[PDB]
Amino acid sequence: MSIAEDITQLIGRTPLVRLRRVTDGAVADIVAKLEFFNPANSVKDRIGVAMLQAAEQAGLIKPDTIILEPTSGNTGIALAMVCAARGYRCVLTMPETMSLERRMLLRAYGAELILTPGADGMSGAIAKAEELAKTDQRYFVPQQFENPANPAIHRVTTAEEVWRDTDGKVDIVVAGVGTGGTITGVAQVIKERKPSARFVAVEPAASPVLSGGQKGPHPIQGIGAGFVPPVLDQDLVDEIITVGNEDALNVARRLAREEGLLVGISSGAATVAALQVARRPENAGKLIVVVLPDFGERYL
Amino acid sequence: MSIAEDITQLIGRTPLVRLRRVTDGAVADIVAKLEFFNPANSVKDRIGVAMLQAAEQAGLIKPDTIILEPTSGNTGIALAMVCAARGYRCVLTMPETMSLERRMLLRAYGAELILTPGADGMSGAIAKAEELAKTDQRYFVPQQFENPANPAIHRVTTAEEVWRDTDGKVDIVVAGVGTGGTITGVAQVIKERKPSARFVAVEPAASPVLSGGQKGPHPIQGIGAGFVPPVLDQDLVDEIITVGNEDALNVARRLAREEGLLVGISSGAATVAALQVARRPENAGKLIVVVLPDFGERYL
Ligand SMILES: CN1C(=O)/C(=C/c2ccccc2OCC(=O)O)S/C1=N\c1cccc(C(=O)O)c1
Ligand SMILES: CN1C(=O)/C(=C/c2ccccc2OCC(=O)O)S/C1=N\c1cccc(C(=O)O)c1
Ligand SMILES: *Cc1c(COP(=O)(O)O)cnc(C)c1O
Ligand SMILES: *Cc1c(COP(=O)(O)O)cnc(C)c1O
Numbered sequence A, B: 001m002s003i004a005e006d007i008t009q010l011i012g013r014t015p016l017v018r019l020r021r022v023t024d025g026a027v028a029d030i031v032a033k034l035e036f037f038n039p040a041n042s043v044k045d046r047i048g049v050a051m052l053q054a055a056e057q058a059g060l061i062k063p064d065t066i067i068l069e070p071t072s073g074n075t076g077i078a079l080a081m082v083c084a085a086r087g088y089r090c091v092l093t094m095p096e097t098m099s100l101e102r103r104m105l106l107r108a109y110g111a112e113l114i115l116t117p118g119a120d121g122m123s124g125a126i127a128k129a130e131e132l133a134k135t136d137q138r139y140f141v142p143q144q145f146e147n148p149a150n151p152a153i154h155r156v157t158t159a160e161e162v163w164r165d166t167d168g169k170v171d172i173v174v175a176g177v178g179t180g181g182t183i184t185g186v187a188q189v190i191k192e193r194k195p196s197a198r199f200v201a202v203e204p205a206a207s208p209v210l211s212g213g214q215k216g217p218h219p220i221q222g223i224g225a226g227f228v229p230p231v232l233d234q235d236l237v238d239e240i241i242t243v244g245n246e247d248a249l250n251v252a253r254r255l256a257r258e259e260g261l262l263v264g265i266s267s268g269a270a271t272v273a274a275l276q277v278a279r280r281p282e283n284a285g286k287l288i289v290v291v292l293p294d295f296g297e298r299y300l
Helices: A044-057 A074-086 A100-108 A118-135 A149-165 A181-193 A245-259 A265-278 B044-057 B074-086 B100-108 B118-135 B149-165 B181-193 B245-259 B265-278
Strands: A016-018 A029-034 A066-070 A089-095 A112-116 A172-176 A198-204 A239-243 A287-292 B016-018 B029-034 B066-070 B089-095 B112-116 B172-176 B198-204 B239-243 B287-292
Touching (some): A044 A149, A074 A089, A089 A118, A100 B245, A172 A181, A181 A198, A245 A265, A245 B100, B066 B074, B074 B100, B198 B265
Parallel strands (some): A066 A089, A089 A112, B029 B287, B089 B112, B172 B287
Antiparallel strands (some): A016 A029
């Protein structure tokens, strides 16, 4: 019998698809890992479950614990879904600038939202979470940017899925860096097993922090956090490619129209970079795996 | 190597999950088949690909063919996605009442929309498609309510997935009837292989046509078509349960909040009916498979 006990057991195990049309000038094979196949349509499902599992296994969840995280992204949606399956109480802080669509989605999962001043943005959401946690001991805050379970779940699931589905033939992995968990976990496993493997981090040209530049605003949701996340292991990253907003959006649109892959803007970004790498003659005949983090419908 | 050639090869093979909390008074086991795991988040992905495959295999697609279908539902989204993967031109007719969100989603896949008068509703969308097809021979119209490939793909995929994942232990399948393809295809295979198996069709109390009542408006998108669809085989249906709008919506909300299963209203409907059947003492210890047709996010 193959029946999951709950929805969190159906997280991960996402498929690879070969790009057929969005391949201009490529001399390498480009295959895309479709993180939108996760139950709530993003890669963050993996760290939502994993950060809570790790807390559970370490005895950090008490009968009165409340899950708390400042998030304006997919991690909130994943945490809300995972808390609803677990029967945990979930509080999320975010700027009051968040769309009503997003709020309704979080509340549909039974999450409670604390809206913080629009002008303070993310830092205000963090300050509010910091203060709530400091003054009420019931709160457990997963801390997606620091939590070792983020890269760990990618070592154990994402990486092995890439390894097995490519029969060890993957040569290059291309991934947008938000928390850095995905590329770090995959590199940690794959680079040791196959030392010739290479890893390309993608960030916005508009906020080129890993390249050595300065934080700036940008629309590529999920990547370009504006600082070097502690979870990221830069020594495993072989190259950084910056991607402009317009190219990221153009390639995302091409993915939907030409491959039937309706993906988010950060998937467009990662694909820009995978196309770039794929054009290099030294990469003729190589297999490039590109991570597509989420579904595009959420962005319309 | 496990790499799909395109997105249409990743349709189907959706998982079963056991309901844990939305089970009040049940004496039977209730497991849910999560059709939202399909690439465009609904069961209709299966018939989008299948109706086009059948046309291809029967030589009905010509170099200048244009796909045309009147649809205000998930079949449009599936057809748009499948046409985008295939590189076919896709035209959909629908009432101008359709939300801008829906239109943007269809156009994101490169589909072309013909908006018909709001007052004529579905019949106007059908009349427009009828007339375009009649006067331009390039149009191929899949005809989801009549196309034998609709129940066929359910015989070949959905049914076998239910059979294998339950190790032949499924006793009762509960499914909302829209086109009727799902319940028909599953019954056709399962009832012959296990003649004690039973099948429950679900329709809206607000439009109880299969029960012998009259068409009326209702919000349970995907079911209650308002007539007996030709594709449906009523002789395989063992019982009809009607479901009220409020119960359908209440159970859908409970699924999201209590199981982390964010599903559409018709999934709430099917679950109402599965809970009802599950309370009958004669069903103690039986395995009930309930089809959950789509993701809830599209409804917010
Ligand atoms: C644009 N942006 C930011 O500005 C962020 C700031 C942030 C978020 C969490 C912790 C620290 C933080 O930065 C303070 C610093 O500069 O050290 S996080 C961010 N984007 C992301 C990237 C990935 C996930 C998320 C999320 O909110 O779930 C947000
Ligand atoms: C509420 N409703 C209707 O009223 C429909 C009418 C219809 C749709 C297609 C063909 C015939 C039709 O009816 C005319 C008749 O009464 O014989 S179809 C419908 N709902 C559904 C159910 C399942 C799928 C779809 C869809 O538009 O993709 C629509
Ligand atoms: C989280 C996220 C990323 C980056 O993944 P990390 O493992 O955090 O580096 C990219 N895109 C989107 C849409 C995300 O939600
Ligand atoms: C199509 C559909 C159904 C019914 O499935 P059929 O196989 O057409 O009977 C139920 N709910 C939703 C949301 C649908 O799109």
